[PDB]
């Protein structure tokens, strides 16, 4: 009793002093006696005799010591399980980034000395540390190892996500290495940073997996109005026809789109830009073929929607036409080249951090206009991702209070909001100082700015002033715009959200109910938690249309990618389907948000979905940007067109060679009828193998990744055991004739 109490309090006070001295590496270091290290390391080593495979990395991490855990992995079995469990424990302790980067950068030296390197550790580390010194070795060892099949995966996912500016620098870091196997390294380095193969395969299976029904579109044509929902019909048609380039639905008649000279044609052309994407010739040629007679359209919304739609098409592409967008943007036009050209130019130049778009953007916002200043604010926020210019923040906050318009304050608000990324240790005095501003718009700009800055639930202090201003402040602007930061920081755990926002579900004013409805929509998106679904019923019945619209959107963000046999969704399916037939007795905007919510489930024909994070746990920047701008439709409805940037198709990839497509057919341990498609009305116990062939991989639930079983009699088999869904390659084990190569498609709706 006495010994276990003195070693218990000795360990508690030991790690207490280790925490009190862990944040101060140098200066005023407290002296530590050697006998304490002896009596702690004695019983500590006694526990480290076999490590019991549970407390080695735990107590090794609690002591915050430098060489305490390097000797633990020496005599230990299942090294990948010890490093995977190690990083799993490190990612769940709410790290402050002060020691996580050191522990990772010191633990990435052990797998290179083994017989073979692993990818889960280098990926799960490179998604967080983002250090250039940790990639210079692995980019040059690819030539020394002379292994082509293993580099395609790491190139696919590192060049896929987890970095934008680190990719913008690593593309020239790898471009410098090599010639200014020489014949193979050239095509390798060229084909790894291409990135168009993903667009080709996604356009391929997504071009041959489409399924449309006449009941939905016929219902939209039956419930269409010429005043409000005209944009909802074309944005729902753009959602359901995204990626498939199906313009034949809009080729039926021209009297349904250009019947009114207003913003409806701009939302229709931008919606067309959401329909087709990833075209270098058919995009500009398709936009120019509409009226190649006089080059003078009476309605400039076609040109503005052509520039904005072009920016939607060339988003994050390496073949940008920005050079032509400067010569085309230089022309003087009325609020269409400035607005649409500024949005398209900023979206196409996102992450470039070029000073040219900064200069022309400043001289474009110097006209004191609110529309081109709002679009210039969005474009500046997009292009300044990671730039963090010195005079830009002070110039924008200095330009904020010296004007009366509000669209300029929201445009510069999102402009200074999206620029803040990775400034956890920097934006403390900025957000804390700008939080007490007299302007409610800038007060919302502090919360939206700190939203993306504290991603990962790494700061539990900002919620004090987030909820403190959500409840204490009397203005409903920061009250309904406050909880979006709460969801953006607490998006990790879907279960903990309804426990703290359930009080905000039925609040005092409908504004906190609407913003809280957006919070439930963004926090539980892509998941299957019923803690909000069981609370959606009280949200959809209220005399206020705000909580009804936000309730239909929040329910539309959860009903996607879900089967009926798992949960009884008949309630929200029936009450949500009764809104378009009950729209005669409802408000004008209630049917707008109703059919707009119905366009979310039918988006892409159940093939494409949305995701807030990647497979390795890292979050996607264009997904968060796309969902926040998607929620910014309250002030400006045409801003919802950025939802296509968050569409992440869930499927598998078994492409072995860049020009050879194999066929992989696995089997699932579940019932095939339970995973089928919910075919609507016409209105004129184990499967043998999966339906994924020629790789057209269909949709897949993240929960289905644990029931997949590869066939033992399959001719081909990858080198890495396929355990979780992602992007991998196939290893040719037979190395013989008859590789079963399939041809390519021909001309049509796509290129």
């Amino acid at each position: 009793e006495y010994v276990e109490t003195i070693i218990a309090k000795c360990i508690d006070h030991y790690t207490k002093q280790c925490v009190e001295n862990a944040d101060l590496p140098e200066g005023e270091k407290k002296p530590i006696d050697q006998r304490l290290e002896g009596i702690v390391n004695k019983m500590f080593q006694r526990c480290l005799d076999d490590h019991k495979y549970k407390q080695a990395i735990g107590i090794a991490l609690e002591t915050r010591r430098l060489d305490v855990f390097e000797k633990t992995i020496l005599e230990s079995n299942d090294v990948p399980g010890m490093l995977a469990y190690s990083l799993k424990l490190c990612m769940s302790l709410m790290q402050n980034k002060q020691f996580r980067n050191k522990v990772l950068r010191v633990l990435v030296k052990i797998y290179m000395n083994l017989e073979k390197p692993d990818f889960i550790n280098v990926c799960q580390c490179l998604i967080f540390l983002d250090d250039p010194q940790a990639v210079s070795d692995i980019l040059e060892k690819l030539v020394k190892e002379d292994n082509l099949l293993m580099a395609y995966q790491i190139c696919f996912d590192l060049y896929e996500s987890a970095s934008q500016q680190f990719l913008s620098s690593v593309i020239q870091n790898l471009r410098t290495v090599g010639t200014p196997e020489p014949k193979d390294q050239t095509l390798k380095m060229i084909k790894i940073l291409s990135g168009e193969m993903a667009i080709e395969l996604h356009l391929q299976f997504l071009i041959r997996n489409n399924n449309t029904d006449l009941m939905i579109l016929k219902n939209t044509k039956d419930a269409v109005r010429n005043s409000v929902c005209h944009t909802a019909t074309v944005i729902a048609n753009s959602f359901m026809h995204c990626g498939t380039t199906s313009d034949q639905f809009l080729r039926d008649n021209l009297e349904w789109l250009a019947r009114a000279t207003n913003w409806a044609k701009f939302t229709a052309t931008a919606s067309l830009g959401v329909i087709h994407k990833g075209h270098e010739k058919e995009a500009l040629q398709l936009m120019a073929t509409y009226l190649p007679k006089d080059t003078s359209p009476g309605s400039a919304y076609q040109e503005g929607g052509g520039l904005y739609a072009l920016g939607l098409i060339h988003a994050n592409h390496g073949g940008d036409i920005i050079d032509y967008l400067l010569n085309q943007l230089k022309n003087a036009s009325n609020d269409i080249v400035r607005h649409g050209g500024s949005l398209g130019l900023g979206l196409a130049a996102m992450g470039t951090a070029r000073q040219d778009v900064y200069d022309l953007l400043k001289t474009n916002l110097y006209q004191d206009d609110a529309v081109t200043g709002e679009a210039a604010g969005l474009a500046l926020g997009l292009v300044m991702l990671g730039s963090k210019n010195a005079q830009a923040i002070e110039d924008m906050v200095g330009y904020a209070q010296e004007t009366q318009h509000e669209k300029i304050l929201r445009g510069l608000a999102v402009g200074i909001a999206l620029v803040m990324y990775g400034r956890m240790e920097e934006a403390d005095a900025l957000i804390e100082s700008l939080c007490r501003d007299k302007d409610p718009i800038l007060r919302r700009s502090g919360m939206y700015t700190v939203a993306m800055a504290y991603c990962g639930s790494g700061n539990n202090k900002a919620i004090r002033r987030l909820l403190h201003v959500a409840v204490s402040d009397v203005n409903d602007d920061v009250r309904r715009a406050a909880v979006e930061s709460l969801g953006f920081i607490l998006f990790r755990t879907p279960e903990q959200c309804p426990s703290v926002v359930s009080l905000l579900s039925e609040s005092y004013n409908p504004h906190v109910r609407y913003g809280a409805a957006m919070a439930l929509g963004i926090c539980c998106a892509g998941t299957g938690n019923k803690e909000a679904i069981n609370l959606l019923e009280p949200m959809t019945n209220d005399p206020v249309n705000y909580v009804r619209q936000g309730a239909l959107i929040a329910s539309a963000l959860i009903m996607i990618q879900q089967t009926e046999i798992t949960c009884p969704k008949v309630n929200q399916f029936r009450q949500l389907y009764s809104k378009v037939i009950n729209d005669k007795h409802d408000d004008v905007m209630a049917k707008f948000g109703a059919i707009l919510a119905q366009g979310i489930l039918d988006a892409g024909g159940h093939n494409v979905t949305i995701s807030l994070q990647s497979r390795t746990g890292h979050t996607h920047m264009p997904s968060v940007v796309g969902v926040l701008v998607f929620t910014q439709f309250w002030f400006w409805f045409p801003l919802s067109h950025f939802l296509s940037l968050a569409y992440t198709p869930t499927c598998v990839i078994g492409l072995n060679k860049d020009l050879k497509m194999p066929k992989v057919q696995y089997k699932s341990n579940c019932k095939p009828s339970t995973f089928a498609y919910p075919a609507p009305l016409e209105v004129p116990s184990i499967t043998a193998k999966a339906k994924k062939k020629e790789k057209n991989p269909a949709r897949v639930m993240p929960a289905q990744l644990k029931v997949l079983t590869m066939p033992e009699t399959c001719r081909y088999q990858p080198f890495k055991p396929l355990s979780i869904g992602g992007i991998i390659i196939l290893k040719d084990t037979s190395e013989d004739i008859e590789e079963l190569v399939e041809p390519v498609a021909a001309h049509g709706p796509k290129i």
Binding site: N226, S227, V228, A260, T261, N262, W263, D369, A370, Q404, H405, K438, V544, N545, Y546, V588, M589, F592, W634, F635, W636, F637
Partner: protein, 287 residues
């Protein structure tokens, strides 16, 4: 053929001028003129608002004197008021805030110069003092009956415009007659000057005068309120003696709408003045 989403900016100047003009808003028809500056298409700001002399004819185009209007506007141009007129306002007491044929005729005649022609009608006669929510009026084109009525974007603010939801005027006369949203604006000078001015309007001169008045009236006048407060307390306890019988018999359902708790809590709140001011007397006696 183009339309945008306009919003009328309303500061405290026009609001207070409509409050004093509403106090002087006799049943006789009155006239007014609003001023401001046009910065862009879809925004309008009002700064200068004055009143007009009443006449036996009332609201009419003949009552508007062009030499008096141009004279006063010139006297505002020679001073630090470089703003042009943006509209005209009036009051409709009794018969509702709707517009008659004469009002829409003089509005049609007065909208030839300004395309916006902001029209505001204040009616504080029958409006309760709890809310002072006001609504702005607009004129629709007669040739737009074939196309949509109001092709205005940003349909979010219509929920805020649905607060005046009277079931006779809005859709009782919605044909050829719509409205527009209203927002406010306040800088730091109005916030601190008006906030401190209102707090001072509810405070004392030196802020130490009327404290000892209540601190010393606790022994003279408040004693009567304490004895009467105990008289009401006993007046409730005489029934609270009968409560444990019913509460000891039925225990199912509540029939008396009286709570008998929050009233006693309020009595305790009125009784805590002695405790809160005891330390005040301790400070006055101490130093």
């Amino acid at each position: 053929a183009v339309d945008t989403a306009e919003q009328v900016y309303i500061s405290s100047l026009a609001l207070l001028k409509m409050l004093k003009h509403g106090r002087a808003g006799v049943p006789m028809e009155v006239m007014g003129l609003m001023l401001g500056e046009f910065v862009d298409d879809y925004t309008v700001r009002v700064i200068d608002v004055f009143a007009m002399p009443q006449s036996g004819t009332g609201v009419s185009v003949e009552a508007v004197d062009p030499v008096f209007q141009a004279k006063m506007l010139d006297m505002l141009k020679q001073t630090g008021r470089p703003e042009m007129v943006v509209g005209w306002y009036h009051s409709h007491p009794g018969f509702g805030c709707w517009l008659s044929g004469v009002d829409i005729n003089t509005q049609q005649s007065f909208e030839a110069l300004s395309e916006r022609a902001v029209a505001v009608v204040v009616d504080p006669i029958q409006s309760v003092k709890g809310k002072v929510v006001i609504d702005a009026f607009r004129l629709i084109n007669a040739n737009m009956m074939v196309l949509g009525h109001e092709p205005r974007q940003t349909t979010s603010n219509l929920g805020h415009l649905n607060k005046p939801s009277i079931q006779a005027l809005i859709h009782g006369l919605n044909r050829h007659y719509y409205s527009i949203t209203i927002n406010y604006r306040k800088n730091e000078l109005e916030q601190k000057m008006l906030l401190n001015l209102h707090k001072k309007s509810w405070m004392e001169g030196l802020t130490l005068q009327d404290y000892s008045e209540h601190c010393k009236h606790n022994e003279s006048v408040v004693k009567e309120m304490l004895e009467l407060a105990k008289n009401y307390n006993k007046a409730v306890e005489e029934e609270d003696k009968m409560t444990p019988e019913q509460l000891a018999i039925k225990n199912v359902g509540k029939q008396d709408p009286k709570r008998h708790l929050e009233e006693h809590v309020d009595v305790l709140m009125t009784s805590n003045i002695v405790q809160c001011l005891a330390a005040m007397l301790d400070t006055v006696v101490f130093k």
